[PDB]
């Protein structure tokens, strides 16, 4: 019953893996002070020749590599979503903006990005955003604070896939960077996610290996 994952792009700086019929993980790498060399995940949803991207790679160069691949595949890139204000979500937004691809994020991500002098998403939403992807859609939803105050998820119901971003930890992973975190809210937010999407088959964390609903339960337990 498992989908046979397939690598569809690989370079020194970026890997893209198909993880379900319509969803893909993009992986870029961050050499950071306190935690080592860090893989950062985003998601691409592709259907009917159209694509929506969740998170940019941290750097402009890696984001251009991502967009070059989507262009070689002849895809219309409809939107990019920054799932919170940190650079492993939006460091590469100008590559999207240069191509007239609109960027979206939680309303508070816009103000936080501006206050940090980071690339700014163009369009804010307050609650739940629907983004068309071909004949399907992907949904962006705020369930509360956790990894940051503004973090949002992406939900693609056709394949029962959740992009948890940095609010969701890989199975067995540590708590990671808590500098901007609300650890009181975090388990409450994650339980709201589990309760909303009980049928999930695939959960993609912001860092590390993706998996199934286990990741939601693991993350809630880690912060309980
Ligand atoms: Zn973050
Ligand atoms: Zn992160």
Author numbering: 29 to 46, 48 to 100, 102 to 104, 106 to 107, 109 to 131, 133 to 150, 165 to 172, 1173, ...
Excerpt from the publication:
The class B MBLs are enzymes with the ability to hydrolyse virtually all β-lactam antibiotics, including carbapenems. Phylogenetically, MBLs can be grouped into three subclasses, B1 to B3.2 While enzymes belonging to subclasses B1 and B3 carry two Zn(II) binding sites (Zn1 and Zn2), B2 MBLs are mono-Zn(II) enzymes. Here, we investigated three of these B1 MBLs,6 SHD-1, MYO-1 and ECV-1, in comparison with the clinically widespread enzyme NDM-1.
ECV-1 originated from Echinicola vietnamensis, which has previously been isolated from sea water. The structures of MYO-1 and ECV-1 were successfully solved by X-ray crystallography to 2.17 and 1.33 Å, respectively. The structure of ECV-1 was refined to an Rwork and Rfree of 0.16 and 0.19, respectively, with one molecule in the asymmetrical unit. In addition, MYO-1 and ECV-1 harboured in total three cysteine residues (positions 69, 121 and 221) within their active site. The lack of Lys121 or Arg121 in MYO-1 and ECV-1 was compensated for by an extensive network of water molecules. Interestingly, this loop was shortened by one residue at position 231 in both MYO-1 and ECV-1. At position 233, asparagine was present in both NDM-1 and ECV-1; however, we found tyrosine in MYO-1 and SHD-1. In addition, ECV-1 demonstrated high catalytic activity towards meropenem (65% compared with NDM-1), whereas imipenem, penicillins and cephalosporins were hydrolysed to a lower degree (∼10%–40%). ECV-1 and SHD-1 exhibited thermostabilities ∼3 and ∼8°C higher than MYO-1 and NDM-1.
